Structures are given as C-alpha cells and as structure tokens.
C-alpha cells in the first residue's frame, strides 16, 4: 500500500514520507477529511502533520528494541480519513544502523590447560553478540599473535560463529606458566566495531623433567687416615618441576656393593655423603659410588651421578 523508509536513531522531526501527497490530499482536504493516525500507539514514534501532511519521526527510534534480530523491521501504522471513511495501511521500514559493538559475556576468561596437552587440542571460547542485523553483526574473530595457539571459527546452525583455540605447539611450564591472549570480535560494518575478551591460559604442571646432578661424573680423593664422620661431598640435584614433582630423594644405586654401603652413608635429604668406616691402601685403592636422585612425582623421574673415590 504505502511504503516508506527511515534510518534508525534519526533525530525527531526527520521526514519519512508525504502521506497527503501520495493520497491525493491537497490543502483543505487534510482538515475536511480529518487526516489522522490510527491509534495513540501509532503516534508513539510518529507524527502526522496537518500542515505539511508529512509523516515525521516523533521520538527517536531504536531498531534493536522494536524488531530485535529480525531480518526486516516493518513498522505498521494506520492512516484514517473520513468522508468516506477509508483506512490506509502504511508500512515504514526501519533501516538498520551499525551503532552496536560486539559484546562478550565476561571481559576476562581463565583457562587451566595441562602441560601435557597435545597439539590439535581444541578449546571452546565464549561467543560474542551483536544485536545489529545483516552485515552489521559479528563478522569474524582474531587472536593476538602467539607461538602456541591458533584460532579456528566454526559457523554452526543459523550462521552464528563459535570460536575455539587450537594448540599448535606443546606448552612448557618451565619456560612460562602463563599465556595472555586477546580474543577480538569484529562486525562487518563501515567502519567496523569490535569488542575484546582477555584469555589468560594457566599452564598446569606435569612431571616432564628428571632430576639432574651438577656433574655427571665426580672424582674425589680422601687420605688413608680419613676419620669417621668426615664429609666426602654434598650432592646437588636440581628439578625445575613444581611441588612434589620438583622435590627429590637421594640414594645409592639399587645394586651398590655392601662394602660401599658399610663405608659410606648418604643423607637422602641433604645429599651429604659421609665416610663412616675405616680405609687403607690394602683393602681397595678406589671406590665407585653410584648416586641417584629419585623424584616424588607420578610417574617418578630420576637422575644419576657416578662418584669415583680415590684413596
Ligand atoms: C646446584 O646446581 C644449581 C644448578 O647448576 C646448574 O644446573 C645443573 C643441572 C648443572 O648443569 C650445572 O652445571 C649448572 O651450573 C646451582 O645453581 C646451585 O648453586 C647448586 N647448589 C645448590 C646448593 O643448589
Ligand atoms: C577492535 O577492532 C576494530 C577494527 O577491527 C578497531 O577499530 C577497534 O578499535 C578494536 O581494536
Ligand atoms: C578486551 O581487551 C582490551 C585490550 O586487551 C581491553 O581494553 C578490554 O577492556 C577487554 O578486556
Ligand atoms: Ca540502536
Ligand atoms: Ca542498529
Ligand atoms: Ca554492530
Ligand atoms: Ca614441558
Ligand atoms: Ca613440568
Ligand atoms: Ca621432576
């Protein structure tokens, strides 16, 4: 019947269409036939003038509030003229404006990812929203430049987008236990509007390290008259892992000779090796002690140090 177009968020007084002209009403016709909007509801957003006969915007119109996520916003108004009483249907289309920015449910997102996460692992992300319609809604996502993750966007169901993290390289807590990424959602307007979500990846610890002694092989010498209680050497094994995965226990090799165990005694905690028995040149000119640094993680890791004792 009567179709006009008006831009969303237009200021009150904005022209929409000439009702009087498109109906054949000129001058006194507007009064004699009583030009009029249908009900009080029709005049909420519009006003029909008795002077110009033009349909204008009464109150600022928000397209998102009226039609929401509808494809086309068609606002029906009722124009009444008397003698003869004839009613005219007028459909005013509310053109969408790109005045809404992509929104996330939460400004920040935390992810607890294990250090043993294999490449190809997919981690879902919160989807953004843009109440605008057409190209003005969410178009694509971007992920801040990193060295471990990749961004993949899957469009499911009705064409809405669901972003997810794709692990490219294996994480390592020993290098950095945290990664901060910025998920940015962008719409397809000109100019484009965006919104962000701060993703902080927490790398959980995994026992992926074995204890390592300061030296692979140590050679020391003690006099023939070394008294009982004398410290030979204090072992030093390091483990970069967190918590119990980093704590270690010292011990001899499982097949260490009984002679060595009767002569020497190590403190499993401090790693201090003491000579406790007698030694001469005749018994043996040398002893080869096998040290071991057992981890406390599951599974347990271990390092090894061979100590050569000359006398
Ligand atoms: C124990 O060793 C710490 C680390 O030493 C380094 O790492 C080991 C695995 C070897 O490769 C060694 O050659 C390196 O220098 C030292 O930082 C630390 O001071 C040592 N002592 C104690 C009491 O921790
Ligand atoms: C999100 O991205 C848009 C362009 O895509 C920027 O204009 C905005 O400032 C924000 O960085
Ligand atoms: C997304 O990220 C931007 C920049 O990282 C922040 O400024 C914003 O508040 C949101 O957290
Ligand atoms: Ca709006
Ligand atoms: Ca809009
Ligand atoms: Ca938008
Ligand atoms: Ca690692
Ligand atoms: Ca680790
Ligand atoms: Ca370890």
């Amino acid at each position: 019947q009567l179709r006009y177009s008006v831009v969303e968020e237009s200021e009150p007084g904005t022209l929409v269409g000439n009702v009087a002209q498109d109906l054949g009403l000129k001058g006194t016709d507007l009064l004699s036939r009583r030009l009029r909007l249908g009900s009080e509801e029709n005049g909420r957003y519009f006003s029909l003038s008795l002077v110009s006969g033009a349909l204008a915007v009464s109150q600022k119109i928000d397209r998102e509030s009226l039609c929401g996520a509808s494809t086309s916003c068609l606002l029906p108004v009722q124009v009444v003229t008397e003698h003869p009483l004839e009613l005219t249907r007028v459909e005013v289309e509310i053109l969408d404006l790109n005045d809404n920015s992509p929104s996330f449910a939460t400004p920040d997102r935390e992810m607890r990812i294990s250090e043993s996460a294999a490449p190809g692992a997919r981690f879902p992300l919160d989807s953004a929203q843009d109440p605008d319609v057409g190209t003005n809604t969410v178009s694509f996502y971007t992920l801040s430049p990193n060295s471990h993750f990749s961004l993949h966007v899957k469009t499911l169901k009705d064409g809405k987008l669901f972003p997810e993290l794709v692990l490219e390289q294996q994480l390592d807590r020993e290098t950095q236990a945290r990664h901060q990424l910025v998920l940015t959602a962008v719409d397809g307007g000109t100019p484009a509007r965006s919104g962000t979500s701060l993703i902080s990846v927490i790398v959980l610890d995994v026992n992926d390290n074995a204890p390592t002694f300061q030296s692979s092989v140590l050679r020391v010498g003690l006099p023939e008259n070394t008294p009982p209680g004398t410290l030979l050497l204090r072992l030093n094994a390091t483990d970069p892992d967190e918590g119990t995965n980093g704590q270690l226990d010292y011990s001899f090799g499982d097949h260490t000779s009984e002679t060595v165990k009767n002569l020497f005694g190590l403190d499993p905690s401090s790693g201090a090796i003491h000579v406790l028995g007698p030694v001469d040149f005749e018994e043996s000119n040398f002893y080869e002690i096998h040290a071991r640094a057992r981890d406390q993680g599951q599974p347990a890791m271990e390092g090894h140090c061979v100590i050569q004792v000359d006398v």
Side-chain angles (χ1 to χ4, degrees), residues 1-153 155-280 283-311:
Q1 190 71 21
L2 279 189
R3 297 182 174 272
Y4 304 113
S5 300
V6 62
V7 181
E8 182 205 353
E9 309 291 343
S10 56
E11 288 294 323
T14 304
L15 214 80
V16 179
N18 199 324
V19 176
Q21 178 181 99
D22 297 20
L23 256 45
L25 278 68
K26 295 184 298 296
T28 319
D29 291 344
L30 283 71
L31 281 173
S32 299
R33 300 194 62 179
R34 285 170 158 173
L35 198 51
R36 183 210 326 170
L37 283 178
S39 59
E40 219 72 72
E41 178 60 44
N42 302 78
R44 175 183 294 271
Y45 298 107
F46 300 110
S47 290
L48 193 52
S49 182
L50 288 180
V51 178
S52 59
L55 183 61
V57 177
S58 172
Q59 188 187 354
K60 201 170 182 181
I61 298 176
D62 187 28
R63 193 216 62 88
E64 277 66 61
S65 296
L66 291 179
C67 297
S70 300
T71 303
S72 64
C73 189
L74 268 291
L75 222 59
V77 292
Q78 192 170 161
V79 174
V80 181
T81 59
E82 296 184 29
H83 312 103
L85 192 143
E86 48 173 342
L87 307 92
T88 304
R89 175 176 177 86
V90 181
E91 297 183 354
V92 179
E93 185 180 13
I94 315 295
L95 305 181
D96 178 36
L97 207 63
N98 191 33
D99 54 327
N100 280 270
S101 302
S103 179
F104 283 102
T106 167
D108 40 31
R109 168 79 188 278
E110 175 176 322
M111 276 186 161
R112 306 237 183 181
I113 301 180
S114 173
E115 192 180 2
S116 60
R122 289 179 165 179
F123 306 89
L125 297 176
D126 299 329
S127 180
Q129 301 169 5
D130 198 331
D132 289 338
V133 156
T135 62
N136 295 332
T137 186
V138 175
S139 178
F140 64 97
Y141 291 84
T142 61
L143 185 70
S144 61
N146 45 230
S147 58
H148 295 281
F149 294 99
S150 178
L151 186 58
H152 181 257
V153 176
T155 157
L156 53 87
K157 198 188 176 182
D158 54 340
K160 82 164 301 180
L161 305 169
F162 266 87
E164 61 181 0
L165 287 182
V166 178
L167 191 59
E168 293 287 348
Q169 289 186 348
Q170 178 59 276
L171 305 176
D172 184 24
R173 183 202 146 272
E174 279 72 51
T175 57
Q176 48 171 328
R178 270 184 51 101
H179 297 83
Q180 282 198 170
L181 308 183
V182 178
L183 178 59
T184 307
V186 191
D187 57 51
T190 47
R193 323 176 82 99
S194 49
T196 56
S197 187
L198 197 273
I199 307 171
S200 66
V201 176
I202 313 296
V203 178
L204 300 178
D205 188 41
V206 170
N207 199 330
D208 68 278
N209 279 85
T212 295
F213 291 91
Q214 192 175 5
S215 300
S216 180
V217 171
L218 257 171
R219 179 184 300 180
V220 295
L222 86 173
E224 186 178 1
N225 58 326
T226 303
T230 302
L231 176 66
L232 185 66
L233 80 169
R234 184 181 287 101
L235 291 170
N236 185 36
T238 67
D239 197 283
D241 291 337
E242 182 182 4
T244 60
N245 292 13
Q247 288 185 307
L248 31 70
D249 294 316
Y250 298 97
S251 71
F252 296 110
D254 283 324
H255 295 287
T256 300
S257 178
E258 187 177 352
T259 310
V260 179
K261 299 203 185 75
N262 279 323
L263 265 181
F264 308 94
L266 66 93
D267 192 335
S269 294
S270 65
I273 296 186
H274 297 268
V275 47
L276 307 158
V279 282
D280 58 50
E283 288 156 353
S284 186
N285 298 34
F286 61 95
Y287 297 104
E288 184 170 309
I289 305 179
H290 178 201
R292 191 240 315 274
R294 179 79 67 176
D295 209 350
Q296 290 189 5
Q298 299 174 356
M301 303 297 198
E302 64 179 14
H304 301 273
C305 177
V306 172
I307 301 183
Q308 294 177 336
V309 178
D310 171 84
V311 58

